[PDB]
Ligand binder design. Sequence first.
Ligand SMILES: [Zn+2]
Lengths: 58, 58, 154
Amino acid sequence: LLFCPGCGNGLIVEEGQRCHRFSCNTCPYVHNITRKVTNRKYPKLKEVDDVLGGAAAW
Amino acid sequence: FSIGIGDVTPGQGLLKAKYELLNAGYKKCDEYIEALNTGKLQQQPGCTAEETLEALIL
Amino acid sequence: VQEIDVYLAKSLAEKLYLFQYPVRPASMTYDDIPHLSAKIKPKQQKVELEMAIDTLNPNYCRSKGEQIALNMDKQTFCSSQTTSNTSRYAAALYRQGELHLTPLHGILQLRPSFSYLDKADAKHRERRRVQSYEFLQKKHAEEPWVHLHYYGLR
Ligand SMILES: [Zn+2]
């Protein structure tokens, strides 16, 4: 979510010539090859445990 | 056949047994709580800490 | 123990009206001195200006053309007032040697007026209650004869 300076209506990327033309009054920042980065690191499934027979006697 | 409060009063041997068991049972549970939050506590295979702590409290 | 003293400066603060911008925090945006076409109301400011758009961003072009009205392109504002009781806030200009209190008038927020989509839909049509108050303003909205200019003043 990158907002518009001037109306503030949220990010829309047109895939023509790499701009950010919003649904309102055009403020297309034609970002050059600056590489977009959004790595939202997730979770990693973490191994397992054997659910042992150490305790069941009580 | 009759019941009374003499049939419920602990003798001398219970009180010195319960007093140590309430102390030595509370020293470890004070440490098992302290081994969790202050530092590193090993985990039972069921869940993480603060879940196997209670199963080791019980 | 900075014991700096606060003057209860009587320099007329009736003129002072705080303007707020819950719109321009991204890059310390200053509104910029050049733009004119200034229009302001005393009550419900509705600051209407010449926020002409740049052309450094590449033309914008057809969609601007698609806009229908643009008069370069006004990015006007309607003042969201918050003046219920308006003396709770009255601070002014403060050196490390002197401090001048001035009691302001009602603060007004200044979000961007659209009215392009408002008028745009009407155009398709061609193809509240006591909303303006009893006196229809007949004046506060008429008052916009405005000159934002630069002068060192107190
Ligand atoms: Zn925009």
